[PDB]
């Protein structure tokens, strides 16, 4: 339960965010360590970033949207999470065994979500308990908790949830399902209305420590401190941009 662990000297504050709450379920070398568990096991992204990023588009490509904004529960065949226009599935509860590394969620600012049983109480088993789970269920904040989450699964692929995104309408089958700010293609698809993950705009994702892991081809990116407002609350946060 409570590691009381004797004493520590300096001026103190609270209990904070624990590491044991990280699901290290990683089936490519298991681990000799923890940094070991994540690199020499799973994320083997070497240099294919030019042609991985090839399958993504500028926002200009997509069909202009008519009329009123709706929400899409389709998410189908859209399977390139490193592109800004990935239309993700709304967040469910994902069992701890399918996660390698920490899970980050975005009230646009990033926060860690830890392992827990199906009744919401934190578990500190490094997610190796079977009943451990990552309860990611989301609702768009000013009221819910976050616009979306990104994490890495047991074979090291990045996978994201959030939203659900917006059906801004469109002319043809070459049409956009907006997971971010879009007021280019439709003048009401802002991040607060359609943002479904870290992607602040088509070309800026929220900087966070495992941004280099989950979205690896944004290494070369430039980091900016930007304000944002989410139903009244001020968010100041770094964005990796290009």
């Amino acid at each position: 339960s409570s590691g009381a662990s004797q004493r520590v000297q300096l001026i103190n504050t609270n209990g904070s965010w624990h590491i044991n709450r990280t699901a290290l379920n990683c089936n490519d070398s298991l681990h000799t360590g923890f940094l070991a568990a994540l690199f020499y096991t799973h994320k083997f992204n070497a240099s294919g970033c030019p042609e991985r990023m090839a399958h993504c588009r500028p926002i200009d490509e997509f069909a202009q949207g008519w009329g009123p904004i709706t929400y899409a529960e389709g998410h189908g065949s859209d399977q390139r999470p490193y592109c800004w226009h990935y239309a993700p599935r709304q967040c469910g509860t994902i069992p701890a065994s399918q996660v390698c590394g920490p899970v980050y969620c975005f009230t646009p600012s990033p926060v860690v979500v830890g392992t827990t049983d199906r009744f919401g109480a934190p578990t500190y088993t490094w997610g190796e308990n079977e009943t451990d789970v990552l309860i990611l269920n989301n609702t768009r904040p000013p009221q819910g908790n976050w616009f979306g989450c990104t994490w890495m699964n047991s074979t090291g692929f990045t996978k994201t949830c959030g939203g659900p995104p917006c059906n801004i309408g469109g002319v043809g089958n070459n049409t956009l399902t907006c997971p971010t700010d879009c007021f280019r293609k439709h003048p009401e698809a802002t991040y607060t209305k359609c943002g479904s993950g870290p992607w602040l705009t088509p070309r800026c994702l929220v900087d966070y420590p495992y941004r280099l892991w989950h979205y690896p081809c944004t290494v070369n990116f430039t980091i900016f401190k930007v304000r944002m407002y989410v139903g009244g609350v001020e968010h100041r946060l770094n964005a990796a941009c290009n």
Partner: antibody, heavy 124, light 108 residues
Framework: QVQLNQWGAGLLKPSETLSLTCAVY????????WSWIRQPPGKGLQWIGE???????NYDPSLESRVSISLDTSKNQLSLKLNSVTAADTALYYC??????????????????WGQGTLVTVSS | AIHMTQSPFSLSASVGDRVTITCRAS??????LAWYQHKPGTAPKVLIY???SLQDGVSSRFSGSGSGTLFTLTISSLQPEDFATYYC?????????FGQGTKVEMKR
């Protein structure tokens, strides 16, 4: 979409103490508040009380005398307890997660995540 | 204690109508108001918070307006799923106080 979970014994006889718990999924974050609501049969929704990110609470002046709400952050569990219960406390008891933010002057509250209810029949 | 009085307590409407329930505050509650939808068997849903904002994925039919002492929920065209009971609720005062609810039945 986020839905909460309520536990607790629902049948009471008068002068016992009703004691529900409610798994608000998710850690306490700044501005978050949690509250309990009851629907006595045939009546409207009725406010019991709130506890927020700070641990301090508004109750209903009717029930302050004998009610209490805590939040055990260790298990992410909300708690409601009604003392000296009367047969009139029979109702359907809801627990709700919500967010209250102040843009300087004005503020808004709202409850976006809810329990399932627990019917509590108090009757001898 | 800020008393909210909600109008009308009952209301019969067809599918297609505009429906405007309202809710008046004894004193000014700024615009800390909130609108909830209650159907027998289910928990309540927030539809509108801050008296005029739409909760994520609550339909465009639902317009919230007003401020001070006088607030409306307005449904654009009534939909079969919309038939429920609606309660307002202010979040400005020491005792949170509801409206009495408006039960919106279907006409036949």
């Amino acid at each position: 979409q986020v839905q909460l979970n309520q536990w607790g014994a629902g049948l009471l006889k008068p002068s016992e103490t009703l004691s529900l718990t409610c798994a608000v999924y998710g850690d306490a974050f700044s501005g978050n508040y949690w509250s309990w609501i009851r629907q006595p049969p045939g009546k409207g929704l009725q406010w019991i009380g709130e506890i927020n990110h700070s641990g301090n609470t508004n109750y209903d002046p009717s029930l302050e005398s004998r009610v209490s709400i805590s939040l055990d952050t260790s298990k992410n569990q909300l708690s409601l307890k009604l003392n000296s219960v009367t047969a009139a406390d029979t109702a359907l008891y809801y627990c709700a997660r919500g967010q209250r933010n102040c843009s300087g002057g004005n503020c808004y509250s709202g409850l976006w995540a809810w329990g399932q209810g627990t019917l509590v029949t108090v009757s001898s | 204690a800020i008393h909210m009085t909600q109008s009308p307590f009952s209301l019969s409407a067809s599918v297609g109508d505009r429906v405007t329930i309202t809710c008046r505050a004894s004193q000014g509650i700024r615009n800390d108001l909130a609108w909830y939808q209650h159907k027998p068997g289910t928990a309540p849903k927030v539809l509108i918070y801050a008296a005029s904002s739409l909760q994520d994925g609550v339909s465009s039919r639902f317009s919230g307006s007003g401020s001070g002492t006088l607030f409306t929920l307005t449904i654009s065209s009534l939909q079969p799923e919309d038939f429920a009971t609606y309660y307002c609720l202010q979040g400005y005062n020491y005792p949170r106080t509801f409206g009495q609810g408006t039960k919106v039945e279907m006409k036949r």
